[PDB]
Design a protein around this ligand. Structure first.
Ligand SMILES: [Ca+2]
Ligand SMILES: [Cl-]
Length: 369
């Protein structure tokens, strides 16, 4: 029902019932990037100015060597643009500060990215940090990246910071050359599979003619011209054990199940983003995660930044309180009859579904989080 169309980031508060919440003006938000953000900061200025918003206070942080390579990755600017504009829109147009934690591009292995995570945790200034990135968890495990980075995320959670991590864009086929159909062989992304982050999957978002929420289905846009699947990542880690709050999803393996929650990701229902000055309609779970980050930062500002890492509370609250979410029920995250199916309650494509922010805010006021 409803219509599939692109959306300005300033629409996400209306869509996810956040208009009545404070903005994130009292919460600092981080974004992990690969390389520099010089064009992204110009695109952010275009965004805030076009939408008549107060300018956003930004900082850029070289997280690795002094002599590292923090040049702009040109294609990457569109990703940091998606992240930053979607955060600020979802946040209601205001964040206290946006911190870009830039990974060194000339560091060995995945150590530039690991150092960017590390800096965000060590500084402990951002309450919420967006990670619109990932790759096959088995590859991360094989070279020690998984173990090194999980230590950092564990410190974050203990400090009360929320890392939000996109679940992936390959459906169940993350490890098959990043999204080529592979029958019944299913896999998941890192760092989404960490139990120390909030993993965010993807929906197809339908709105009414007045722009209200109508419905969400699983994000699955099928194959591109290369034969690669575009769909929400979801499944379970082969390595990470199930954190005990996930026990409420009965009949699942003893592994970290993902995603936790989901928001808009279909390109066909995606965000209108300024990229090198030009408006483009962009999706991915790289959209869904920044939507969560901006919305969650509103709830942090409503609660004096006192909400800790929220995974356990999400699973207890939502399992007991279905009115807190839009439960996705239709669609699949594979191809050719394979993959996981959405269904009643928690499912592998979408987790609990999307948050109804004003309802969650009322729950937190009554019950804490
Ligand atoms: Ca569901
Ligand atoms: Cl845990």
């Amino acid at each position: 029902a409803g219509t599939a169309k692109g959306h300005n980031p300033t629409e996400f508060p209306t869509i996810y019932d956040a208009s009545s919440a404070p903005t994130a003006a009292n919460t600092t938000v981080g974004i992990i990037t690969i390389g520099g953000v010089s064009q992204t900061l110009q695109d952010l200025q275009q965004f805030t100015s076009a939408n008549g918003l107060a300018s956003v206070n930004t900082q850029t942080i070289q997280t690795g060597s002094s002599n590292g390579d923090y040049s702009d990755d040109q294609q990457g600017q569109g990703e940091w643009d998606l992240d930053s504009q979607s955060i600020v829109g979802s946040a209601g147009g205001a964040v206290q500060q946006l911190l870009f934690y830039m990974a060194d591009q000339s560091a060995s292995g995945n150590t530039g990215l690991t150092q960017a995570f590390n800096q965000a945790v060590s500084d402990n200034v951002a309450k919420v940090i967006n990670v619109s990135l990932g790759w096959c968890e088995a590859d991360a495990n094989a070279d020690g990246t998984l173990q090194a980075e999980d230590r950092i995320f564990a410190t974050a959670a203990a400090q009360g910071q929320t890392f939000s991590v996109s679940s992936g864009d390959e459906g169940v086929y993350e490890c098959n050359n990043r999204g080529y159909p592979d029958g019944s062989t299913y896999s998941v992304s890192w760092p989404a599979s960490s139990p120390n982050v909030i993993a965010v999957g993807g929906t197809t978002l339908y709105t009414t003619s007045a722009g209200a929420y109508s419905n969400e289905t699983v994000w699955n846009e099928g194959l591109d011209s290369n034969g690669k699947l575009w769909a929400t990542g979801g499944g379970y880690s082969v390595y990470e054990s199930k954190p005990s709050w996930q026990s409420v999803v009965s009949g699942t393996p003893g592994r970290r199940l993902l995603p936790d929650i989901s928001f808009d990701a279909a390109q066909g229902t995606g965000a209108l983003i300024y990229n090198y000055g030009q408006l483009q309609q962009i999706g991915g779970t790289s959209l869904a995660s920044p939507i969560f980050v901006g919305l969650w930062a509103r709830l942090q500002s409503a609660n004096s930044n006192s909400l800790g890492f929220p995974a356990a509370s999400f699973y207890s609250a939502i399992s007991s309180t279905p009115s807190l979410v839009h439960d996705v029920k239709s669609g699949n995250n594979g191809y050719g009859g394979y993959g996981y199916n959405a269904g009643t309650g928690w499912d592998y494509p979408t987790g609990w579904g999307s948050l109804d922010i004003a309802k969650l805010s009322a729950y937190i006021r009554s019950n804490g989080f």
